[PDB]
Design an enzyme around this catalytic site. Structure first.
Site, PDB file in Angstrom:
ATOM      1  N   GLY E  38      -1.625 -20.903 -33.041  1.00 28.67           N
ATOM      2  CA  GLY E  38      -1.047 -22.222 -31.735  1.00 28.67           C
ATOM      3  C   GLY E  38      -2.295 -22.649 -31.366  1.00 28.67           C
ATOM      4  O   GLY E  38      -2.579 -22.387 -30.328  1.00 28.67           O
ATOM      5  N   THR E  39      -3.712 -23.008 -31.789  1.00 29.68           N
ATOM      6  CA  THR E  39      -5.024 -23.053 -32.014  1.00 29.68           C
ATOM      7  C   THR E  39      -4.715 -25.069 -32.299  1.00 29.68           C
ATOM      8  O   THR E  39      -4.764 -25.513 -32.911  1.00 29.68           O
ATOM      9  CB  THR E  39      -5.966 -22.821 -32.133  1.00 29.68           C
ATOM     10  OG1 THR E  39      -5.980 -22.670 -33.672  1.00 29.68           O
ATOM     11  CG2 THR E  39      -6.478 -21.914 -31.873  1.00 29.68           C
ATOM     12  N   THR E  40      -5.088 -26.224 -30.899  1.00 29.62           N
ATOM     13  CA  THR E  40      -5.928 -27.057 -31.106  1.00 29.62           C
ATOM     14  C   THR E  40      -7.338 -26.962 -31.831  1.00 29.62           C
ATOM     15  O   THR E  40      -8.142 -25.869 -31.368  1.00 29.62           O
ATOM     16  CB  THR E  40      -6.683 -27.468 -30.045  1.00 29.62           C
ATOM     17  OG1 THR E  40      -5.945 -27.254 -28.874  1.00 29.62           O
ATOM     18  CG2 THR E  40      -7.288 -29.150 -30.173  1.00 29.62           C
ATOM     19  N   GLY E  70      -9.052 -22.401 -38.212  1.00 28.05           N
ATOM     20  CA  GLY E  70      -7.857 -22.533 -38.665  1.00 28.05           C
ATOM     21  C   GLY E  70      -6.228 -22.896 -38.145  1.00 28.05           C
ATOM     22  O   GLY E  70      -7.021 -21.977 -36.240  1.00 28.05           O
TER      23      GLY E  70
END
Lengths: 238, 97, 250, 233, 197, 275, 245, 232, 238
Positions: E38-40, E70
């Protein structure tokens, strides 16, 4: 003598420049007995000279499909394989396209079937020649196959043992055949078969099968005393 | 089990098949034939089934020599954890089973 | 024979496979590995054949590869064959330790690689894996054992045996001077040096030209323990002290 | 006697118990391009002779000394085709090992795996052994390592060794020369001099190649570095 | 069977694993849960290089020049970039030349296509190879586009709005990484500027 | 000749020189080895015995009982011709029969006419092995070659055996050829063989024996497309009867050829490997 | 093989000799020489070149159909010397493998890497008992982004290597020696100079002061990295300039 | 003008100059190495009898070799090699089981011998060293057959195979007539097996198993054999 | 000639290579069988000692089922596979059929496995032969012989491997219903038949005793020696 090295494989050439094991398969036709095959404009007849009376019933003439059958001169394992293959070809032609299979085409299918072995290691040439007699839209057919993958179209032929006698008869009366009846054409075939036989021997409704297809006629294998009526009319070895 | 099960089971089948289709259509009938005869010859050279075999000739003919996948690096079959009888394994490969 | 000696599928008039007998000859020409099953343990004395001055050792043992906690083997014969065979011995043992959570009883493991080597005769186009391996073992069934396996798969169990060079010779020396039931690992390690020293003519068993591995049991755990340079130096100098004492006696 | 039946087939044993196709693949090794592995204090050197000594050759193309992972490389005497496909494989197995254990493959481990390819290729029938032997060196665990894998797939750690041509002469000279404590500044010179024993011509950055392992890892010496070592000896 | 077993993904739990799902779900019970990025994530192109933005980092390694952000599953982003890294090392080892971003892209796409986005690797693939600064938008399902800039994951929309507003065709390096940082800042968590020249 | 992919395999020999090297060995002249090939030697012999004495015969038939002709037949069809033509008439009392085994074989019975013990006969329907052929010439001929004895050898050959410029199929299904000895002063009757053409086995053994001891002998060689009881083959042994060699031995061709009718209808259980 | 291996050291490729030789790869080098032509490649500053003397013995044989110059992709040529069938087959294999490389990655195969691939395919032929070498000598040219002209040759035995001039075929070794001394005294050869060297090497060792239709010049330049062979007019103008100077 | 050692007779694939595959005919010699099996098809059934050639009075004559059942109506009499018989018995038996599990009909005798010549004719890497003798009374009626090395089959009225194939088929030639009863076939098979056998026919050194239109394939008991071979 | 391939015939009509695997049997260690009154016994000689060799690891009488056991007398490793695989197939049958598995059944399996190894020359036939005795569901005593050729055969008294004929000929006499009635007498019989085979008695003998109620249960060398002394006391009485 030098051919020694190069005769014992089907996938080796010689200095002389010929594969001898294909020529030996074409000698293995002759180890089987004399089948005659000759046609008219109405019918395509086969005859077979059946080499005990109790044992070895010997089914030389074989029925492939309604329109088509063969007679066998040479290796019988191969005779079976080839006939059974043809039955499948014609089954499939009448399953998908719902028609007979051309005789020319079916003999070409056998041609390529019998070439694979000769150009492959671990394989040997099908050691048998057939006389592949069907009837198409075209008209009647005879089609000699050889133990070698090559094959012929014929209006008359004999293959097997001391079968030159028959071939000679079938050249002498080649013209008669074109314009013969069912039974006329048959007696001609039987007189070729009888030219092969010694003069001390005869047809004597015993060493006679007769495999005739034609116009409405389907390939029907007259044997035992269904050949008697055809041999009634034939007379005078002289 | 899963969709991917069979997509991966027959992955290599339904690739080299596609390679042979391409070559048939462009180069000719000869091009698949030649590649096929090489592959089958070099995968008539490995260990008996029951020992884990390193088939360097077949891998480099495919171009796998310089390419890894999950096939290689998961479910290590070289430390297989389930092996049968040597003789019976060989019979299966021969087609006696 | 000049025939029946090719494919390892081809029997003789007698009923002999000469291929497999030539794999036995290839053991004939290998490192002497002398095993002596004892009371206290079971030892695996050896000739450390390759001892060149430029040649390096970055391994734990030379010919002696261990299998699980409870077993080890030696190697006499074809070296590459042996490498894959000794990797396979570990993996066999571990599959049984995965399914039944027990360290493989000794006969099972020996027999498993014998089936492999019996396939490698049965099936022609394969070469008879030209190694014999002497398996020092402990299991819960049969206390301590020594074993052998052959290229054929023909395997046995032993109170003392040898593989490799002067192997029949060494087994003769054991049959003279082994005393089943009296033989502690102490007196077995003594017999091991003695028999090596008697069967091969290496100065006074140079301690870097022999190696022993003792599979013993300490506090109900199996202890596969290589003998130090120091410790085979102690065994050989004591063997030679006894030799000299006996030379004074005679 | 001739005993030639046994010396054609690699799956046979001989009357006395010899594997003779192995021996003849080691004869292909023993008519090879002289290589010298000297595992020294500060890393290994793989100083070798180039099978080209020509006016016509692209320096950037061919390498006797190839890396497998950063820290490993190797050099060969015998067969170039065979060498090249074996090191394509070597590189694969190093990266497989680093996707399984995430540890740069130990020199010993890699050696086992490439020598297990060698093992199969003497075992089976309708193949030949590889006619090439591999001085697979490299640096792990604050330690230099050198090995010597064979056509057969038998592999052994070395402090100092040689293969190819005048290679027993190599190991004789190198037994007289190599010290246990000899460090890699002096081992490159020693390996250059072991080549001089097994050389035919005048020796130059062209006519030999050198490549070394270290603390850092494995590389090949630049033509400049090689001729500077030849100028220093 | 008496057939040698092979390697890859094993599909044996599957139906019995789905029996666990069915039971536990029905009763109101938990089974272990997939761990995610759950990364920008972010990427840009400028005159003569790439920048890859991320938040905490998503930026992974492929080759000396090639890096690859990723978004999606964390397991799978890391797994694919590591395997593709090893593949491009093997390629480079033989080639003799540092591997290309076209090579990275083709391989990633093709691998993620084989496994039909049942593996979550929504990556922003940025390298500066011989043929120059390349950026791609590798997707889990084995799709991609070769874009001047792209953002994915957790506030991608806000990040992309910043990008497209505050992008110039040929940037300078510092304004290029400024853009990826303020784009990450919009989606969000330390800005993660993996700059490439 | 490879049981596995890539087996090192050698060519078949014309000279069997590796077999001559195996001779050299004698299985390293081992006692059990040499014993069991002497068990194979007493397996693979001839043993001339007649079943009137019901004993064994020692030295000769042709120097033991008088020989004036000696009418040989080497093959089914050769012995069928002597059954048909020569021995439609006469007693031809048995004096001898070579009792042999080889892998392939079948009777080797000897006779001589009661009227003329002088005139002699053999019917070798069996095969005699290359080693047993000189043993066979050490039985019926024995020793003391006479050169007073017309050795009328008949033999059945395959059309394929004959060397020619045309193919083996192009050859006429039947013919016969001759090969006769320096001494032999009567007609070849058939053409003599070509230069490339040779014979081997027992018929060759007899004619070669005859030549070295200068004896009248002739080797009739019936190159027919069949090797099995055939009217045409035995009436291509016909020409022999109308030469000196077989002129006072043949009788009554009507009787003979009705007997040949019988020979043909004897029949086989012929195998089902062709149809 | 199906039929198997062959008793004797030089009779199969998977049997080593007492000395440690594989002899059917050495007879695949005799098959390079059996070709009946010589090829000469010349690398330079700007250009890589591949020239070969021409033969078309039959008047009837249409001279347009008969060449040893082929291309594998746009940018990368070869010239062949050895057996016609085998050389066409190795050219065809290079096409498959160049396309495979490009399909896998999305940039085209380097010269050296295509040569390496074909040499590894040859390595497999020579290690396996069924297959045999293709008795043909592929001499790839082409321009590389980084490395420029690349004159590389690959063998039936399956050894690949880089060069700054190559010679193969019949006068192989004679022309290798010619080129050694040319390259010893090289003048960073441009298109003209490389083609001159290559043409006139063949015209020395075979001693045939050629007509345009007694050679075949394939050539690639940094200018035009598309591999592109000469017309009768162009290859004539070369020979005319070599005769003039 | 020189003698050559050319071999076409080591390989089953290799043709002689005449065009002979010798190994098939060497497997015919292996049928002749096996035990005599006399079958006689009649109007009222088909019989199979066959000699056991029991050698010792330690080997168990109570056990049944040389003859088998394949379904209700059909079995065969094996002769040559029992090891090779087995795999063709299994074909026949499983493919007629399958016929009954497909069509709910028992497969015709001609079709069972077709099935068997599909498992044969496939050289197993050698010409099958067994001849079977398939005696069933199917839908169509009584039927004897004969199988050989080459792999093929052929239809019979009276056939003797094995040890004295032609020794005992010449007896059948005189003895069998078209209007044979199954009782006649039983007794004639046995009495000719008796005058072939070097041993004297009791019920212990013979397997007989016979089928009629009415009474399906069974194995003639000690007592039934004893009765017939007391009369014959 | 035809002894250089497992899968070739001869003019005389023999597979000599298969008969050479039976010569490898013939080079065995005398294994003896009896099939008595609710008893079966398998006496088999120990052949060689080697002072310092464990005997557990090298035994000639192996048990296959609750109600099947055998005595092998040819090659050792070949036999190990046959016996391992006889237990595999025993268990297959037992599981599926729900039967204490027939002796005949697994003699037929051992036979058919050796037939499976007779039908390639890229394999070899296991050169071993087993006297597979035991009982059935109901309890009928059994004795059999299996061959490298791959045929099973039923027996009452047997004697295979080393000095096979010698010891078979002893049983031709000494195997009788008054040497069978009791289990003592059948143990005595195999011992006394091995007192033809091998010089030593109660010394180099290894003797299995399976009953209708019981299983193999190998005897002690003291137990066998008692019966050696019983037949020695019978020899003192006579």
């Amino acid at each position: 003598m030098f051919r020694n090295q190069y005769d014992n494989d089907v996938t080796v050439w010689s200095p002389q420049g010929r594969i001898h094991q294909i020529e030996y398969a074409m000698e293995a036709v002759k180890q089987g007995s004399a089948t005659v095959g000759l046609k008219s404009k109405t019918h395509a007849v086969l005859v077979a000279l059946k080499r005990s009376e109790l044992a070895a019933h010997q089914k030389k003439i074989l029925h492939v499909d309604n329109h088509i059958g063969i007679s066998i001169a040479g290796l019988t394992a191969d005779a079976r394989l080839l006939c059974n293959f043809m039955r499948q070809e014609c089954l499939d032609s009448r399953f998908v396209f719902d028609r007979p299979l051309p005789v020319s085409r079916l003999v070409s299918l056998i041609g390529s079937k019998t070439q694979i072995p000769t150009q492959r290691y671990g394989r040997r040439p099908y050691g048998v020649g057939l006389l592949i007699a069907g009837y198409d839209d075209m008209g009647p057919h005879i089609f000699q196959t050889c133990p070698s993958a090559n094959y012929f179209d014929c209006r008359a032929m004999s293959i097997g043992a001391r079968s030159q006698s028959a071939r000679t008869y079938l050249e002498r009366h080649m013209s008669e055949f074109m314009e013969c009846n069912l039974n006329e054409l048959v007696k001609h075939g039987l007189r070729a078969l009888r030219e092969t036989l010694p003069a001390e021997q005869d047809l004597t409704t015993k060493n006679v099968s007769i495999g005739i297809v034609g116009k409405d006629l389907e390939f029907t294998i007259y044997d035992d005393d269904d050949v008697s009526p055809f041999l009634e009319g034939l007379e005078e070895r002289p | 089990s899963h969709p991917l099960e069979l997509s991966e089971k027959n992955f290599q089948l339904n690739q080299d098949k596609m390679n042979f289709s391409t070559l048939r259509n462009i180069q000719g009938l000869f091009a698949p034939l030649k590649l096929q005869m090489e592959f089958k010859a070099v995968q008539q050279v490995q260990r008996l089934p029951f020992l884990s075999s390193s088939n360097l000739s077949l891998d480099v003919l495919r171009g796998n020599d310089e390419t890894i996948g999950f096939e290689d690096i998961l479910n290590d079959p070289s430390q297989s954890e389930v092996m049968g009888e040597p003789h019976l394994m060989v019979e299966y490969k021969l087609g006696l089973l | 024979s000049r025939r029946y000696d090719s494919r390892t599928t081809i029997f003789s008039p007698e009923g002999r496979l000469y291929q497999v007998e030539y794999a036995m000859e290839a053991i004939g020409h290998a490192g002497t590995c002398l095993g002596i099953l004892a009371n206290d343990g079971v030892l695996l004395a050896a000739e450390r054949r390759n001892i060149h001055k430029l040649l390096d050792e970055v391994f734990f043992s030379e010919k002696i590869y261990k299998l699980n906690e409870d077993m080890a083997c030696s190697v006499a014969g074809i070296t590459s064959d042996a490498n894959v065979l000794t990797n396979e011995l570990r993996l066999i043992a571990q599959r049984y330790l995965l399914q039944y959570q027990e360290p493989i009883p000794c006969e099972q493991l020996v027999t498993a690689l014998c089936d492999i080597k019996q396939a490698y005769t049965q099936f022609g186009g394969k070469r008879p894996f030209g190694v014999s391996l002497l398996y020092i073992g402990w299991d819960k069934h049969y206390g301590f054992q020594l074993y052998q396996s052959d290229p054929s798969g023909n395997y046995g169990g032993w109170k003392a045996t040898c593989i490799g060079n002067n192997s029949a010779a060494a087994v003769s020396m054991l049959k003279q001077d082994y005393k089943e039931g009296e033989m502690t690992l102490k007196s077995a390690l003594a017999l091991a040096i003695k028999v090596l020293n008697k069967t091969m003519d290496v100065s006074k068993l140079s301690a870097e030209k022999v190696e022993i591995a003792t599979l013993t049991r300490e506090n109900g755990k199996t202890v596969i323990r290589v003998l130090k340079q120091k410790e085979v130096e102690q065994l050989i100098k004591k063997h030679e002290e006894e030799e000299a004492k006996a030379e004074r006696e005679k | 006697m001739a005993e030639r039946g046994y010396s054609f087939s690699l799956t046979t044993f001989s009357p006395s118990g010899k594997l003779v196709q192995i021996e003849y693949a080691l004869a292909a090794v023993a008519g090879g391009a002289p290589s010298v592995g000297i595992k020294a204090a500060n890393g290994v050197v793989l100083a070798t002779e180039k099978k080209q000594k020509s006016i016509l050759y692209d320096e950037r193309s061919v390498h006797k000394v190839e890396p497998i992972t950063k820290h490993i490389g190797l050099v060969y005497s015998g067969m170039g085709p065979d060498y090249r496909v074996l090191v394509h494989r070597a590189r694969k197995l190093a990266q497989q090992y680093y996707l399984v254990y995430q540890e740069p493959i130990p020199t010993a481990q890699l050696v086992q795996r490439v020598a297990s390819v060698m093992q199969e290729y003497t075992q089976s029938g309708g193949v030949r052994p590889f006619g090439v032997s591999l001085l697979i060196c490299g640096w792990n665990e604050g330690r230099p390592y050198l090995f010597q894998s064979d056509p057969s797939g038998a592999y052994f750690a070395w402090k100092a060794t040689a293969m190819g041509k005048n290679y027993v002469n190599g190991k004789t000279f190198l037994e007289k020369r190599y010290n246990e404590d000899l460090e890699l500044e002096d081992a490159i010179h020693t390996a250059i001099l072991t080549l001089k024993e097994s050389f035919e011509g005048q020796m130059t950055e062209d006519n030999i190649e050198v490549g070394i392992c270290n603390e850092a890892g494995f590389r090949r010496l630049t033509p400049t570095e090689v001729k500077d070592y030849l100028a220093a000896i | 069977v008496y057939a040698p077993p092979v390697g890859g993904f094993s599909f044996d739990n599957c139906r019995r694993n789905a029996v666990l799902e069915a039971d536990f779900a029905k009763r109101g019970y938990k089974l272990p849960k997939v761990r995610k990025t759950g990364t920008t994530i972010a990427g840009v192109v400028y005159k003569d290089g790439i920048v890859l933005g991320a938040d905490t980092s998503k930026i992974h390694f492929i080759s000396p020049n090639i890096y690859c952000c990723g978004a999606g599953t964390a397991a799978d982003t890391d797994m694919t970039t590591q395997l593709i890294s090893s593949n491009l090392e093997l390629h480079s080892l033989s080639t003799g030349r540092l591997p290309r971003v076209v090579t990275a892209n083709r391989m990633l796409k093709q691998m993620l296509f084989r496994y039909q986005g049942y593996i979550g690797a929504a990556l922003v693939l940025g390298g500066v190879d011989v043929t120059g600064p390349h950026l791609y938008s590798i997707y889990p399902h084995g799709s991609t586009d070769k874009l001047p800039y792209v953002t994915m994951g957790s506030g991608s929309l806000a990040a992309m709005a910043v990008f497209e507003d505050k992008f110039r065709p040929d940037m300078e390096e510092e304004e290029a990484k400024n853009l990826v940082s303020e784009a990450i800042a919009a989606g969000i968590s330390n800005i993660d500027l993996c700059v490439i020249s | 000749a490879a049981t596995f992919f890539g087996e090192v395999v050698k060519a078949p020999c014309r000279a069997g020189t590796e077999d001559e090297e195996e001779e050299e060995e004698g299985r390293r002249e081992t006692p059990e080895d040499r014993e069991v090939r002497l068990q194979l030697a007493r397996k693979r012999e001839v043993r001339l015995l007649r079943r009137q004495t019901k004993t064994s015969l020692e030295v000769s038939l042709l120097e033991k009982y008088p020989c004036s002709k000696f009418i040989i037949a080497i093959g089914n069809n050769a012995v069928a011709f002597l059954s048909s033509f020569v021995m439609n008439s006469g007693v031809w009392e048995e004096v001898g029969c070579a009792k042999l085994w080889n892998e392939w074989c079948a009777f080797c019975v000897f006779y001589h006419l009661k009227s003329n013990p002088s005139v002699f006969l053999c019917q070798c329907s069996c095969y005699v092995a290359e080693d047993q052929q000189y043993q066979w010439l050490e039985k019926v001929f024995g020793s003391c070659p006479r050169k007073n004895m017309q050795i009328t050898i008949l033999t059945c050959r395959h059309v394929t055996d004959y060397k020619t410029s045309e193919s083996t199929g192009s050859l006429p299904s039947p013919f016969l050829r001759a090969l006769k000895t320096q001494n032999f002063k009567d007609s070849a009757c058939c053409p003599l063989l070509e230069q490339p053409n040779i014979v081997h086995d027992l018929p060759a053994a007899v004619l070669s024996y005859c030549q070295v001891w200068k004896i009248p002998a002739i080797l009739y060689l019936c190159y027919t497309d069949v090797m099995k009881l055939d009217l045409i083959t035995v009436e291509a042994f016909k020409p022999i009867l109308s030469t000196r060699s077989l002129k006072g031995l043949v009788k009554n061709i009507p009787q003979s050829t009705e007997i040949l009718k019988k020979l043909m209808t004897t029949n086989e259980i012929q195998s089902n490997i062709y149809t | 093989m199906s039929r198997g291996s062959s008793a004797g050291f030089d009779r199969h490729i998977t049997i080593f000799s007492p000395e440690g030789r594989l002899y059917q790869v050495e007879y695949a080098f005799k098959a390079i020489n059996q070709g009946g032509l010589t090829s000469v490649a010349v690398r330079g500053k700007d250009c890589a070149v591949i020239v070969t003397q021409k033969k078309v013995p039959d008047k009837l044989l249409d001279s347009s159909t008969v060449t040893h110059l082929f291309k594998i992709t746009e940018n990368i040529g070869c010239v062949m010397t050895g057996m016609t069938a085998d050389s066409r087959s190795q050219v065809q294999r290079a096409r498959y493998e160049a396309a495979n490389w490009k399909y896998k990655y999305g940039y085209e195969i380097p010269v050296d890497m295509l040569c390496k691939r074909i040499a590894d395919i040859s390595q497999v032929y020579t290690q396996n008992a069924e297959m045999r070498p293709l008795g043909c000598c592929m001499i790839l040219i082409g321009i590389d982004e980084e490395q420029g002209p690349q004159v590389y040759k690959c063998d039936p035995a399956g050894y690949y290597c880089g060069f700054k001039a190559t010679a193969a075929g019949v006068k192989q070794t004679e022309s290798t020696s010619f080129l050694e001394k040319k390259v010893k005294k090289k003048f960073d050869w441009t298109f003209e100079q490389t083609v001159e060297t290559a043409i006139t090497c063949l015209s020395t060792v075979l001693s045939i002061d050629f007509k345009p239709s007694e050679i075949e010049v394939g050539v690639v330049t940094v200018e035009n990295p598309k591999f592109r062979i000469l017309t009768e007019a162009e290859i004539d103008a070369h020979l005319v300039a070599l005769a003039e100077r | 003008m020189f003698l050559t050692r050319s071999e076409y007779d080591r390989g089953v694939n290799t043709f002689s100059p005449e065009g002979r595959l010798f190994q098939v005919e060497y497997a015919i010699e292996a049928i002749k190495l096996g035990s005599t099996a006399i079958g006689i098809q009649t109007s009222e059934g088909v019989c199979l009898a066959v000699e056991k050639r029991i050698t010792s009075p330690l080997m168990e004559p109570s056990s049944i070799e040389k003859i088998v059942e394949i379904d209700a109506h059909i079995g065969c009499a094996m002769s040559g090699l029992i090891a090779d018989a087995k795999t063709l018995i299994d074909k026949a038996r499983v493919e007629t089981q399958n016929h009954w599990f497909t069509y709910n009909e028992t497969m015709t005798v001609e079709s069972v011998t077709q099935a068997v010549s599909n498992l044969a004719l496939q050289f197993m890497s050698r010409p099958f060293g067994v001849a079977l003798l398939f005696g069933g009374v199917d839908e169509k009626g009584p039927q004897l057959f004969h199988m050989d090395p080459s792999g093929t089959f052929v239809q019979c009225d009276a056939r003797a195979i094995g040890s004295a194939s032609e020794g005992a088929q010449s007896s059948l030639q005189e003895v069998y007539h078209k209007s044979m009863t199954l009782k006649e076939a039983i007794k004639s098979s046995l009495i000719i097996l008796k005058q072939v056998m070097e041993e004297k026919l009791n019920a212990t050194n013979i397997e007989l198993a016979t089928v009629q239109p009415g009474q399906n394939f069974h194995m003639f008991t000690k007592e039934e054999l004893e009765e017939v071979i007391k009369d014959i | 000639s035809y002894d250089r391939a497992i899968t070739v015939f001869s003019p005389d009509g023999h597979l000599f290579q298969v008969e050479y695997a039976q010569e490898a049997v013939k080079k065995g260690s005398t294994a003896v069988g009896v099939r008595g009154r609710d008893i079966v016994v398998l006496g088999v000689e120990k052949k060689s000692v080697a002072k310092l060799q464990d005997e557990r690891t090298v035994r000639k009488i192996c048990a296959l089922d609750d109600n099947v056991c055998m005595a092998f007398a040819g090659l050792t490793a070949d036999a190990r596979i046959v016996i391992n695989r006889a237990r595999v197939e025993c268990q297959s049958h037992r599981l599926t059929v729900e039967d204490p598995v027939t002796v005949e059944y697994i003699t037929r399996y051992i036979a058919s496995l050796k037939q499976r190894y007779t039908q390639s020359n890229g394999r070899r036939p296991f050169g071993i032969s087993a006297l597979i005795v035991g009982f059935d569901f109901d309890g009928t005593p059994r004795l059999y012989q299996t061959d490298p050729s791959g045929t099973y055969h039923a027996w009452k008294a047997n004697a295979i491997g080393r000095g096979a004929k010698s010891v078979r000929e002893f049983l031709e006499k000494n195997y009788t219903d008054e040497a069978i009635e009791t289990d003592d007498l059948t143990i005595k019989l195999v011992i006394k038949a091995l007192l033809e085979v091998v010089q030593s008695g109660g010394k180099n003998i290894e003797l299995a005793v399976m009953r209708r109620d019981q299983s193999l249960k190998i005897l002690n060398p003291e137990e066998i020696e008692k019966y050696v002394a019983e037949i020695e006391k019978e020899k003192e009485e006579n």
